[PDB]
Design a protein around this ligand. Structure first.
Ligand SMILES: Cc1cc2nc3c(=O)[nH]c(=O)nc-3n(C[C@H](O)[C@H](O)[C@H](O)COP(=O)(O)O)c2cc1C
Ligand SMILES: Cc1cc2nc3c(=O)[nH]c(=O)nc-3n(C[C@H](O)[C@H](O)[C@H](O)COP(=O)(O)O)c2cc1C
Ligand SMILES: [Ca+2]
Ligand SMILES: [Cl-]
Ligand SMILES: [Cl-]
Ligand SMILES: [K+]
Ligand SMILES: [K+]
Lengths: 219, 223
């Protein structure tokens, strides 16, 4: 339940992005389901959970992605698990996507009319997401980076290495995966990827800006 | 074991499951300076695309500034009175591969001149071709904004691990939030813009149990 400050900082300091995986070490089914749960339990704006997790274990599909996946060229051949996270397309307040969102919350008829009003104000005016489809997509995509973070941190807490991945051609990745029937490309598009496994070598800790530079205190 | 505590599967899940979005804070319970520093470090230490760390954390403790945000901050109107700490995360505007921002990124990594040139080529391909972030100013800002949701996520989890309640916040008027904070002189409006906020403190009331889509619904296994 509760950690000390030391335990929290040892966790976040020791987690590095791992590019060199031991191809002979596999994550147990039990450990990998725990990582997926960390993603599933993530918070999201208005409880939208606008994500899907493709676990790409197929070695033939891993090979096919390599030519346009320069960010994980080595990792695709050596990592235990690969997750491609999709974000919901056209998640408009007035879409059936939000019928499901409200159902899950158990809102009555009048509670739903109020919720639709709130969702519209958020999307149209407050955040101005309804400028174009890409701006609305990028909103769900941001939610999926919460899921990404939780999966990275959870894996690290279990003693499992990981790497978040943006280093691929998104258009060709979208075509590649949609052509495999892995999702409806009218409903979802690729957001971000992540590899999981066990380092093949020591991974040097990487630099950060100072807390003084990152934080502006407004007392 | 080692210098590091090794958590069980059950303890790791506990940490994510026990984190609920808190809207009702005890106004008499304040987060210690030390615990809140820890929370901020979880944000600082977050991963980011190409080590860009394109975030800035405004810690808004000023009660006059908090009350000024209320009229256009309907998603945390009551939290603004009762929460211990408030963090507004900015994302870098116009983080182009050729920008002074990326000179600083490469300077932190200790790249010599030849491997700076190779990094520039990588940044350029990612922004221009792979992710097509240079469509307009907003697509480029939204890429930095996505990095800041990792920092957000890790600060909620850090708070959770320390026994501290939190709420991620999007429920405010962004143009008005930007105007309010920039007119206060808290950042350069051409350099940064508001990405997302979060409240921190202690529950005054028992908060709702999780409602999520099943693992069956969200996971497609490709064996
Ligand atoms: C959204 C995201 C995408 C990333 N994409 C890649 C990638 O494609 N290839 C890679 O080798 N590292 C990738 N990284 C890892 C970052 O380079 C890394 O987080 C950064 O260099 C800081 O190092 P550290 O995470 O080990 O502390 C990515 C990180 C993030 C957050
Ligand atoms: C980016 C983001 C913004 C959110 N903004 C608000 C907010 O403005 N007000 C609020 O009460 N909750 C807000 N939430 C909390 C969500 O409603 C909550 O995460 C979701 O309903 C799931 O509930 P849980 O976090 O308690 O599991 C936000 C969540 C996220 C991830
Ligand atoms: Ca220790
Ligand atoms: Cl690689
Ligand atoms: Cl509130
Ligand atoms: K969307
Ligand atoms: K930017």
């Amino acid at each position: 339940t509760q950690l000390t400050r030391e335990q929290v900082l040892e966790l976040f300091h020791q987690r590095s992005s791992t590019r060199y995986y031991d191809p002979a070490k596999k994550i147990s089914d039990e450990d990998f389901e725990c990582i997926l749960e960390c993603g599933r339990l993530s918070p999201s704006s208005v409880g939208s959970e606008p994500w899907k997790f493709l676990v790409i274990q197929n070695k033939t599909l891993r090979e096919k992605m390599k030519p346009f996946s320069w960010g994980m060229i080595n990792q695709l051949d050596n990592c235990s698990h690969l997750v491609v996270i999709l974000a919901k397309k056209n998640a408009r307040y007035d879409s059936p996507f939000f019928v499901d969102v409200m159902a899950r919350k158990g809102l009555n008829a009048e509670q739903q009319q109020a919720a639709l009003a709130k969702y519209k104000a958020l999307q149209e005016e407050d955040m101005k997401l309804l400028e174009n489809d890409r701006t609305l997509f990028d909103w769900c995509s941001k939610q999926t980076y919460i899921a990404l973070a939780n999966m990275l941190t959870g894996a690290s807490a279990l003693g499992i290495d990981s790497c978040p991945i943006e280093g691929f051609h998104y258009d060709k990745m979208n075509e590649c995966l949609a052509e495999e029937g892995l999702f409806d490309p009218q409903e979802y598009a690729v957001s971000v990827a992540a590899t999981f496994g066990y380092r093949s070598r020591d991974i040097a800790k990487k630099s950060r800006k100072g807390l003084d530079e990152v934080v502006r205190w407004v007392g």
